[PDB]
Swiss-Prot record, chain B:
One of its GO terms (biological process) is cell division. This is Tol-Pal system protein TolQ. It is a multi-pass membrane protein. The lineage of its organism: Bacteria, Pseudomonadati, Pseudomonadota, Gammaproteobacteria, Enterobacterales. It comes from Escherichia coli (strain K12). Part of the Tol-Pal system, which plays a role in outer membrane invagination during cell division and is important for maintaining outer membrane integrity. Required, with TolR, for the proton motive force-dependent activation of TolA and for TolA-Pal interaction. The Tol-Pal system is also required for polar localization of chemoreceptors clusters. The system also appears to be required for the activity of several outer membrane-localized enzymes with cell wall remodeling activity. The chain crosses the membrane at residues 9-29, 132-152, 164-184. PANTHER family: PROTEIN TOLQ, TOL-PAL SYSTEM PROTEIN TOLQ.
Swiss-Prot record, chain F:
It comes from Escherichia coli (strain K12). The lineage of its organism: Bacteria, Pseudomonadati, Pseudomonadota, Gammaproteobacteria, Enterobacterales. The chain crosses the membrane at residues 5-21. This is Tol-Pal system protein TolR. Belongs to the ExbD/TolR family. Changing residue 10 to E: No change in TolA-Pal interaction. There are about 900 TolR molecules per cell. The N-terminal transmembrane domain is involved in interaction with TolA and TolQ, while the central and C-terminal domains are involved in dimerization. The C-terminal domain is also involved in interaction with TolA and in association with the membranes. May undergo large scale structural remodeling, where the N- and C-terminal sequences unfold in order for the protein to both reach and bind the peptidoglycan layer around 90 Angstroms away from the inner membrane. It is found in: Cell inner membrane. Disruption phenotype: Mutants lacking the tol-pal cluster suffer delayed outer membrane invagination and contain large outer membrane blebs at constriction sites and cell poles. Tol-pal mutants fail to complete division and form cell chains, and fail to process denuded peptidoglycans at the septum. The gene is tolR. Changing residue 10 to A: Decreases TolA-Pal interaction.
Swiss-Prot record, chain G:
The chain holds residues 12 to 34 of 142 of the full protein. The chain crosses the membrane at residues 7-23. There are about 900 TolR molecules per cell. Belongs to the ExbD/TolR family. It comes from Escherichia coli (strain K12). The Tol-Pal system is composed of five core proteins: the inner membrane proteins TolA, TolQ and TolR, the periplasmic protein TolB and the outer membrane protein Pal. They form a network linking the inner and outer membranes and the peptidoglycan layer. TolR forms homodimers. Interacts with the N-terminal domain of TolA and with TolQ. This is Tol-Pal system protein TolR.
Curated annotation (Swiss-Prot), chain H:
It is found in: Cell inner membrane. The gene is tolA. The Tol-Pal system is composed of five core proteins: the inner membrane proteins TolA, TolQ and TolR, the periplasmic protein TolB and the outer membrane protein Pal. They form a network linking the inner and outer membranes and the peptidoglycan layer. TolA interacts with TolQ and TolR via its N-terminal domain. Interacts with CpoB, and with the trimeric porins OmpC, OmpF, PhoE and LamB via its central domain. Interacts with TolB via its C-terminal domain. Also interacts with Pal via its C-terminal domain. This interaction is proton motive force dependent and requires TolQ and TolR. Part of the Tol-Pal system, which plays a role in outer membrane invagination during cell division and is important for maintaining outer membrane integrity. The Tol-Pal system is also required for polar localization of chemoreceptors clusters. The system also appears to be required for the activity of several outer membrane-localized enzymes with cell wall remodeling activity. Is involved in the uptake of group A colicins (colicins A, E1, E2, E3, and K) and in the uptake of filamentous phage DNA. This is Tol-Pal system protein TolA. It comes from Escherichia coli (strain K12). The chain crosses the membrane at residues 8-27. Belongs to the TolA family. It comes from the Bacteria. The chain holds residues 7 to 33 of 421 of the full protein.
Amino acid sequence: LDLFLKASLLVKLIMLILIGFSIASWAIIIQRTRILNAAAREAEAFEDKFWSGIELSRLYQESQGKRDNLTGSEQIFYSGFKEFVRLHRANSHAPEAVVEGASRAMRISMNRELENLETHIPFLGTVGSISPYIGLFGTVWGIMHAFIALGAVKQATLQMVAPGIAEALIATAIGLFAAIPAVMAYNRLNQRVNKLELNYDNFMEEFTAILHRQAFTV
Amino acid sequence: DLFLKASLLVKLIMLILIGFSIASWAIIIQRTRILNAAAREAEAFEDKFWSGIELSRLYQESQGKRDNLTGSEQIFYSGFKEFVRLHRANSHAPEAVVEGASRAMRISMNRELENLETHIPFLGTVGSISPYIGLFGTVWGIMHAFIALGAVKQATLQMVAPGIAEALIATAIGLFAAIPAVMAYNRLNQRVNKLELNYDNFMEEFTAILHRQAFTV
Amino acid sequence: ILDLFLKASLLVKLIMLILIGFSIASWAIIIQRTRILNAAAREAEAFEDKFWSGIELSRLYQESQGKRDNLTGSEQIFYSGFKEFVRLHRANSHAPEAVVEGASRAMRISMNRELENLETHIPFLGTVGSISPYIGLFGTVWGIMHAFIALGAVKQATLQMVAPGIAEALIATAIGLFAAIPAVMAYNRLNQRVNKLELNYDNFMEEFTAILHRQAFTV
Amino acid sequence: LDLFLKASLLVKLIMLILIGFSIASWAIIIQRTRILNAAAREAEAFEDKFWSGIELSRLYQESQGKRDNLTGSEQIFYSGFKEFVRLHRANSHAPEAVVEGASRAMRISMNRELENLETHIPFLGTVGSISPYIGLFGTVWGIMHAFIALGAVKQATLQMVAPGIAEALIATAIGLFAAIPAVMAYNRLNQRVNKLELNYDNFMEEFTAILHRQAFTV
Amino acid sequence: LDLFLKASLLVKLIMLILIGFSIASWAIIIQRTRILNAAAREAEAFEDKFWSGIELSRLYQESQGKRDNLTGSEQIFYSGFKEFVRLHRANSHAPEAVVEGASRAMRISMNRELENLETHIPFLGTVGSISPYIGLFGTVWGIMHAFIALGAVKQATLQMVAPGIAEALIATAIGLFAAIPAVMAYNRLNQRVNKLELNYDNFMEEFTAILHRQAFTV
Amino acid sequence: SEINIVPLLDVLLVLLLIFMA
Amino acid sequence: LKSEINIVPLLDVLLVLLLIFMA
Amino acid sequence: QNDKLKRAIIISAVLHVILFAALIWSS
């Protein structure tokens, strides 16, 4: 504390910026981890349940009963079905355009859902890719301040400037400490989100064939 | 203030780093304006699409505004040209016209992507290079400090530090220029990839509709 | 002689604890992962050999119903893809495309479950291998500054109040490197093996869906 | 200063071999970027003609005069059409084997074409992965040799060994700096080769469909 | 090995493990280049032989006696023909299904051949990725041993550590000198292995294509 | 995606010359 | 198949030099 | 096109030698 609160307003400001970045990263960690786990569990449960020998209309009306609470895979089902029935009300698109109308309805909703899932993920990438650089700006500026002062004073064989380099390197230490969990997150959570996106894109591709078969029989 | 007394090579290093920073900032402003404008235009055209209007009327409307046309609209407009250029000259297979239109639309998408993002790879290159240019610059200053030390021997405790600072300011400027470039490289590349996905989806939807309804007309 | 934990700061104690835990976790992951990978590969190749050995599909499915709980490998994919396929075939499904697409979907789901079960803690191995010598660097910089502040207090180092910082830095870098060794040693190996298994499963699906299409279109 | 005569024999050899490696990397860079630019320019410049509207048979007739001078897309077209025509004429009874043969010819021609195109690229990646290491070997040799030299003098004077230590640092000054252009060029040129591969893949996807539609009309 | 005559408690295993790694890597690279060149020449010779006018049966029965000494694409041809014959003569199922069995047999034989060829390549890549870390662990351990071995708290006469520092740095020097050849050889051999794999799949696809035609008749 | 800390290298160099001087 | 330079070995040698020059 | 490769090597050598001459020039 005393070393931190000792002159060098730039050092104080940059360290405060790094601390803010660190706390934001550590909040985003849990924020996007709990939601990611919940979404993964929902996706697995819906994958297990959807093709478990249940008529589509029953699941549709169950979702309608469960509406204004939907999240995850069910959305890309429901947002499709509401369109498929809506288009399928006679004197409308013939039974080969309704499939792509429904697919558009599924896909826009899926992209919106993915955006809702990936809220702050593209911030950990830019908090861990520059936190070391910001800390190094702090440390090099501090070393510069501590070396210009040595050009005027005589002697002082490292017995007066050493705290200068210490106060410089503390910025680098805080930068690395803030940057490590940032890249941990920007790897793990990004891979998990990519997995979820692939799974959703795959569920849509199968549900499109399912709707093809339904329209053929209806 | 210090860009007058350093070595000529260090002068050049500082000059190129400052130019890199200025170019990075100008590119950032230009790209974050043009990408926002393109996204707004794409959203407006998507809203205009699926409005119940026949594609012929939309193409007729787009015909008037040709030179000042960009974004997903072009992907429609040029594509429709191909679809008619192989229709009036009725010398092609029924599935050939849709394939030709798809090829024309893909070429249009590639051209639009090339025009939309221009200096992003330059941003990546500066973000990857600037620390190393700074390292070369400061290494040169450090070696010149040793060369100055070699002239006289009194342990050189006091008179080297200005040289060290004047050598390390090169690295300072280098990483200062590197910060925004690497900060925004991903920020812009993700947006460009989102635009690419949007255009690819639009092309897929156009190809889907062409196969079934628009082929008759 | 290893008693540096007491003769060290709290933060560097924390980072040494983190790194030693990471190393022991990586080694345990290695021991618990290599065995299961080898067993899965052996079971997959054995079942693939048995599948092509002139045995009718119905007999193999009947025999594989059997242990329905502790069933893994390619046999699980086969069972999951055949049970639902025969259910659909008996449940009308007059269109062959419907049943073969359902079988392909079943192959899909079974592989995406089994492979994900196999690929556990491997991204963690890659992450620790990539990031250990930056936690080590952070601890070392902390030690260096803790030495520099001590140096900047008297006219001579005295080699008594500066040695703790040297020991801090050296132990931090050594522990980080020792943690990073096995991770970088084995991450690429295990990932390549998992990719080979993925290719094997994909080719198994290709052959099985080809056979299923032929059977469905025969009658 | 030259700092070569003062440097030890091994250090001088390290400088020489690393200079040679940098020369080779830059020469390969120039050659490969020139060739890739030429191929990319010719790609669309042939594709438009292939899709301008001229008859496929007429375009093939225009070919066969440039037997050995054909470039990527032109050679791909030549091989595919020649194989398809040969199969159809020799057999004249293949229901669907002609398209398979044409696809096989296209695939092998593409593989040969890219293997010729990126003929020297997987050397850049092999100098980017050792240049830091050979430089670090050089500086380690300098440091340990200097310390071994400081084993007889009195007072343990360190400033007297100032040059040699500095020389070791120069080992990595012409060290890592021979790697950065190599790795960046490797990545960028691999990206270009990948985009060209995707372009040729789409070319095949179109060509196989063309033969599929043409086989039943011949 | 003037420095390496006493070692330490843990540094003895260090740099001896690395010397063993370097010797094993040298033996592996020479053996791998020899066997790879022999395999490539044999593959080219078999391609020339098989693309001649010799029929499948003649070439099949020609290599009957070789058996265990048969290496290369000839083993692939033998396994494929054996599998196909075993089904054709013992006619059990439709004629368009035995070709799948022949292709499967050929593919598994190809995988076995590739595994045999690429035997110690992962070890080379592993040691190339691994060696510098044991080197640096060894040198930091040596530095720690030298520092803690300082008897007196001060010991103002510091003119004895230099042999210790040289011995410590020898570990990293040897580790990195072992790293560089392994890292180069890994890519230099993986490129040739990929080439052999590619020209093996080419032969496999061509053989499958030719045997498909006679599968429905013979 | 990965912690790039190469500019720290420069600081390290600057820290040797303070001792041997 | 390598498209990344290693800075850990580059940094650690000069780091060990720093601890050596500390004493 | 080994002649093209040799020409490229010669050109790169010409750039590097003048590069290094300028380095000494400015020293």
